[PDB]
Amino acid sequence: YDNREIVMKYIHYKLSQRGYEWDSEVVHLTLRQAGDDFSRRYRRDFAEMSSQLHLTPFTARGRFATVVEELFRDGVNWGRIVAFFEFGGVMCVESVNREMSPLVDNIALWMTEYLNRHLHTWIQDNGGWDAFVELYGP
Numbered sequence: 001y002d003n004r005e006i007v008m009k010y011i012h013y014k015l016s017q018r019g020y021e022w023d024s025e026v027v028h029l030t031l032r033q034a035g036d037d038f039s040r041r042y043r044r045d046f047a048e049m050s051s052q053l054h055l056t057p058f059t060a061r062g063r064f065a066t067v068v069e070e071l072f073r074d075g076v077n078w079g080r081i082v083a084f085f086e087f088g089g090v091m092c093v094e095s096v097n098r099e100m101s102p103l104v105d106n107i108a109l110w111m112t113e114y115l116n117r118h119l120h121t122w123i124q125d126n127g128g129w130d131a132f133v134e135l136y137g138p
């Protein structure tokens with residue numbers, strides 16, 4: 001699947017939920033629902049994430065890199081991948097909320113690059129997005 005597309009569609013959805021309009025199908029829908037489910041379950045972790053970002057134009061890239069290293073420190077699995085998308089979502093929402101919308105394109109780029117460089121192999125070795133969909137889709 002095309003990672004850039006997966007990222008852009010995810011980001012658009014998270015921003016829309018917060019009242020912002022930003023400018024294979026079963027994969028996007030399944031990922032969406034798992035992300036909503038993640039943020040519902042880990043309610044406090046989700047709620048508290050935005051307040052720990054301290055975004056600035058020059059630190060955002062490093063904040064992203066720091067949280068993502070921690071997230072995947074013990075290895076990759078589908079749950080952590082969903083949390084990774086949810087984290088990117090929180091970053092984008094916080095960016096737009098703090099009048100730093102130009103960060104959104106950058107974040108989308110960092111997510112895409114992390115997918116391509118660091119998650120692609122695990123994903124292919126574990127059945128691809130099709131296997132994700134089989135586990136957590138309807």
Ligand SMILES: CN(C)CC[C@H](CSc1ccccc1)Nc1ccc(S(=O)(=O)NC2=NS(=O)(=O)c3cc(N4CCN(Cc5ccccc5-c5ccc(Cl)cc5)CC4)ccc32)cc1[N+](=O)[O-]
Pocket residue numbers: 034035037038041042045046049067068070071077078079080082083084086087090135136137
């Ligand atoms: C059909 N549908 C109803 C199935 C739903 C089911 C439960 S909801 C869910 C969804 C995704 C992930 C976790 C729960 N889905 C489901 C269930 C289990 C697994 S799993 O066994 O493969 N993996 C996991 N099972 S779990 O114990 O619930 C869990 C928890 C978890 N996290 C990692 C992140 N951590 C906080 C954190 C720590 C360090 C850095 C950053 C953060 C962070 C904070 C805020 C935000 Cl915004 C983003 C990141 C909170 C705990 C990561 C993986 C798993 C995968 C899925 N799935 O993919 O849908």
